[PDB]
Paper text:
The Transient Receptor Potential Vanilloid (TRPV) channel subfamily is a subset of the large TRP channel superfamily, and consist of subtypes TRPV1-TRPV6. TRPV1-4 are intrinsically temperature sensitive (thermoTRPV) and have been found to play important roles in numerous physiological processes including thermosensation, nociception, and osmosensation. The combination of our structural data and functional experiments provides evidence that hysteresis, sensitization, and activation of TRPV3 involves increased coupling between structural elements from the cytoplasmic (ARD and CD) and the transmembrane domains (TRP and S6) is triggered by a coil-to-helix transition in the distal CTD.
We expressed and purified the TRPV3K169A channel and solved its structure by single particle 3D cryo-electron microscopy (cryo-EM). Furthermore, the cryo-EM map of the TRPV3K169A contains a protein density that abuts the proximal CTD and the CD and occupies a similar space to that vacated by the distal CTD upon coil-to-helix transition. Instead, the density appears to be connected to the N-terminal of the neighboring protomer to which connectivity is visible at low contours of the map. Since this density is not sufficiently resolved to allow for unambiguous model building, we built this putative N-terminal region as a polyalanine chain. The coil-to-helix transition in the distal CTD and the rearrangement of the putative N-terminal region in the TRPV3K169A are accompanied by an apparent anti-clockwise rotation of the ARD when viewed from the extracellular space. Notably, while the distal CTD of TRPV3K169A does not contribute to the front side of the interface with minimal interaction with the CD of its own protomer, it forms extensive interactions with the loop of AR5 of the neighboring subunit at the back side of the interface.
Residue numbers in the entry:
A (entry chain A), B (entry chain B): 1 to 14, 110 to 149, 154 to 462, 480 to 508, 518 to 750
Amino acid sequence: XXXXXXXXXXXXXXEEQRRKKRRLKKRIFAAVSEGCVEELVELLVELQELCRRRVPDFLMHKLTASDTGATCLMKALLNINPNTKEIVRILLAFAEENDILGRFINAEYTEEAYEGQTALNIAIERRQGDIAALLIAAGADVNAHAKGAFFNPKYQHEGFYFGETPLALAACTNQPEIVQLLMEHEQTDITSRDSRGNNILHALVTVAEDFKTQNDFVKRMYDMILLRSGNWELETTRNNDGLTPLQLAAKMGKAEILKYILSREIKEKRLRSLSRKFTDWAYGPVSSSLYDLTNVDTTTDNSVLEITVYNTNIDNRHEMLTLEPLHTLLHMKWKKFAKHMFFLSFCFYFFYNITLTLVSYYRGWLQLLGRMFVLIWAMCISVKEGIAIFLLSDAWFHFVFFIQAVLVILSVFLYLFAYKEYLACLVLAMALGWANMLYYTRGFQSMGMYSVMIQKVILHDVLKFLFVYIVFLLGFGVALASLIEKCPKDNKDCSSYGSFSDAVLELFKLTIGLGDLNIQQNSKYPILFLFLLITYVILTFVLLLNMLIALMGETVENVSKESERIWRLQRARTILEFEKMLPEWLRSRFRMGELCKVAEDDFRLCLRINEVKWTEWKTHVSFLN
Amino acid sequence: XXXXXXXXXXXXXXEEQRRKKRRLKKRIFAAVSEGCVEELVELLVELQELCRRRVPDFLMHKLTASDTGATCLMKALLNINPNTKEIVRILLAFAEENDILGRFINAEYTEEAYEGQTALNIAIERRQGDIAALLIAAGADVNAHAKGAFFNPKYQHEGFYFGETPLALAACTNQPEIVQLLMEHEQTDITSRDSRGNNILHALVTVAEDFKTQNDFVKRMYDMILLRSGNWELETTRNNDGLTPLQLAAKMGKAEILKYILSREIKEKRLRSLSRKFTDWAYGPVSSSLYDLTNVDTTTDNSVLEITVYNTNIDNRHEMLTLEPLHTLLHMKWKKFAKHMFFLSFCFYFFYNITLTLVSYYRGWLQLLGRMFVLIWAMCISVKEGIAIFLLSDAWFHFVFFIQAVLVILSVFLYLFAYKEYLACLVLAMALGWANMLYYTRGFQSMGMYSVMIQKVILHDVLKFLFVYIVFLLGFGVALASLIEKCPKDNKDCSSYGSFSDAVLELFKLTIGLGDLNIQQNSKYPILFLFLLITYVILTFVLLLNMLIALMGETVENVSKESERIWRLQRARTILEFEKMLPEWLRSRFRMGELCKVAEDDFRLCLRINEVKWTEWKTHVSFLN
């Protein structure tokens, strides 16, 4: 993004009292920029003090540029010089000699996109730590926020976000030692929060890249910071949206850092009070270990699982899922109730569709008896589908179920009244029904991944082929109809293509191979007709070959691999939907939580799982000696 | 697997004589756990001795927890501390001062899943060797077995198996020096055997991973152990199942360790008495070398080859086969009798089927003459097939042969009686016959691997396509039959689809391309009919394209590679089946064994083979200088 302008060496635009004033001020700024002839700065400072001697507010105004609110020290810090430390010392000494130092160093850069900015921000972004400690020691407020536009962007591509504090900036950026200095300082605040309210930790999450980079600053800095300040009062806090930093890292597709946040095994006493993933009884490869689930068991307001699974703007959900508590929870919930209810609804729907088929085939008293309850199932499934359909590449099947039951109830209704078209609607219904059998191939891996591939092909690859095919079809169709304008001469069979749609249909038969390529009869110029038709055949062939080419390249190496992952995701989505489907009291009966006493005064929910890693253990054994 | 519970820091559950007793005992346990304030342990020990002074059985009971049978020393060993060696020394000194030391250190951890466990087990699993030598020196029984559940699991995924002894644990785990200490000790037993009876070596086999890992503890430990104790009395022994450690490693798919076990060239005198793969006359690349076959020539009760080949739960059989004695044996047996008998049975079966064909084509005296002997071949092949068919992805062809001959004898019988259907059965028979020609494409590599690919495709890829195809077919069929409910009006040809099966058949013709897509006649609403049918066509196309996609991905790089391996395996299976087919006396005539005199008192069977490795030799030549 391109926008309003900043301090730069090169301006983009192409009595002697006023002239002397301009010379002196601009020379001050230019000496700050070059930062070389500090004797020039000394003479200019002596002259400014002499002018003031022959008032401090006007002095600071002559020093502080009113255009962007930029001061000489800020410009000096921007233009990084070898002596720039010396220049900062000199200017600081002169400001002390003037004694307007408070309002000076507390200057907020005044601009539209920059409502506020300390010089310390620049000291840190520029990586000067010695100067940072000096200005901090000088009496610098380390708590003011860069509540601006460039710092708080709407989109990540346009703008730089770090946390709107010095400390968050030191953390996001490399500089750790400065973090130690700021933590040591007494007037420092950690629990201060930005405009959105995201604290330091939330800010850290907004920056850690995924993809398992070899060296990551955020994975370590978070650990150090949390180890220093021992508090559950830090991660318990929330942003504007009421989101925990855990939940925030989950919303975004941030993997390895999330893995860390969910397993913090640490030995010291207060650390143990802070720890997560409490371990016991480990013995060679085998190990029991228990986790905690205070915001993870799906009972919370906006739990972790609902955020991982119902979020489609990531595509990294599968990686997140393979973590311990999540995967174990899904497996447990499956084995407890999904393996029941899934087959249950499968059998209901199967009986339903068979009944529909038989009732459609024969168009007695027991026939009416079944036909009654079929309307009940139709109405029930329609009511269940509509709520999710109105409230919203996965939910297509829901719309399809809703369409089916809608059509069935409509057909039954028009049979209740005096209508003839009803049978038509009816049969279309049951046809759609059998397509929805694909919905239940999720029950099995071998059929499920196949159905996933089928749906992917039907959505991605065929439409581009079919659109261009139909436009060629229509163009050739009108062409050939124009050639076939010769009247039938008392025999419509002599005019095979007298109708446009008839010619279309024959071309489709041709593309299959059923038809009869007639020598052009009832045609004025038959050879042109024939050449044209041949051309159509050729273009269909090459178009087909092109989609067939383009198909193989999408399947480089990730066909089966993405298929299995997507199957697992689909199972997760269904399992969690059923988990919401149950009552509250049944969920009380299924709440898998186990308590624990890790602290003197902490009694939290927990999940005990066993882990068996022959391979990692054998590596551990081999490397140990 | 998740089950009953263990010693842990954190319990999962959420007069002053009794209170003082609880305080003292729990403080003893907690001091053992923390292992820091040894002065607290000293004061507690002084207080316990004072309480006992104002009896040793009650002392050990107050010390030994009766819940899980766990003692203070065991808990101390579990909680590993820096001073834990010092703590063990102190507690040991106090136990000596009490003099109940025997029953103390011989304590068996008493639990349901843990019938018994020494502290030394923990000393070793925890890797403390110094403490191990101390407790061993203290008078520790090193022979007691962990005859429990967790140590002896049914399934490998759930549980940890090592051999149920200290020594087996030291061996399976890294610790070699402890093995030297235990071997040096006089009261040590090597020939002691576990519940299953698998000794140390059998146990080692249960742990060595395959896949040729770069560093493997089992490959070396086995060598050292066997070199120390010079005995054929060790590998001659067997488990509960009567299996040798060789046979056990063969049953499992354990490759490189098996390669080692089958070739042990070693130079020292007693070692030579132990050695395998006796070498002579090696000279540059060329080398003669002879192996031994005391349990490998297929005459033993449960030989190596029968175990490699008739075992399907591995999939690593091909790798095992390329070893020297096996491969040479198979090649020799082939060249001696299989190249005969295979072509023999091929020609018999070929004459048989041709006779069947001709007799089926013409429905004289020589015709009856051939027809007589055909029944003989049918009965004979049926008898040979049924025994293997009843006694049981390879044996499908056997069932097919049995089906064929059964059908033939049935048809001949019903021709013997007064039946008309016989001809039908007859022809079906001969049809199946020609499919079984694939059975004999094993005779050649070029045709054999092709047939392997064909059978794989027919088993794996087409069924998933065809099931979903037929359900679409049936759904669309009932739909279209419902639309075609318009009566024929005196002309069944006007009702092309009046019958359900007829419409099915026409759709199949359509999917081929033979039929005639009729403009919908005898149809109430023809446009819906037409759209529906078009939809079916589209879905067939995309389904076909999907199986075609999924096909290419299964053939990443292992099509021809797995094909050739499977051909070689199939040859092996047939060759060995014929090897069993022969008489006992003929096998006596074909016994390839050659004797040898390696020892003063050893006269074993042997096989002399020559090995030619130009490449390995040239590498040897180049690296040597």
